């Protein structure tokens, strides 16, 4: 049942530039270890932007150039959750972040709002 597949993102919020955030994508209805998964972001008006991917099994991880060295994607196979560690946050990182899974049949979460402000 495709219905049983669920992705729920949390961790978003307000944070100052240079700060850090940990996003969680909690998955149910399927095992995260066996399914490549992706983080996307979407700012209003601008087009959707792929952020990172974690391949099933040991296939590794990949990152968009804008985030290389700043973000880390990881996976907890037991808890069936995928994380996005966000460090050295800039204002251009403001967007809705959501996770997705699936080839041919794609599923996605609603997203979690991340706002990065500049400070003194």
């Amino acid at each position: 049942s495709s219905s049983q597949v669920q992705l729920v993102e949390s961790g978003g919020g307000l944070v100052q530039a240079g700060g850090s955030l940990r996003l969680s994508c909690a998955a149910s209805g399927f095992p995260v270890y066996w399914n490549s998964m992706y983080w996307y972001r979407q700012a209003p008006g601008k087009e959707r932007e792929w952020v990172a991917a974690i391949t099933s099994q040991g296939g590794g991880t990949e990152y968009a150039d804008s985030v290389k060295g700043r973000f880390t994607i990881s996976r907890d196979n037991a808890k069936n959750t995928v994380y996005l560690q966000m460090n050295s946050l800039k204002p251009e990182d403001t967007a809705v972040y959501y996770c997705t899974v699936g080839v041919g049949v794609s599923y996605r979460g609603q997203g979690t709002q991340v706002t990065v402000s500049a400070g003194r």
Partner: peptide, 18 residues
């Protein structure tokens, strides 16, 4: 609250929201 054992159709548990 991290996932918990949720009863599936097959009478077994799978990760789900708590």
């Amino acid at each position: 609250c991290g996932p918990i054992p949720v009863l599936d159709e097959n009478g077994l548990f799978a990760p789900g929201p708590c």
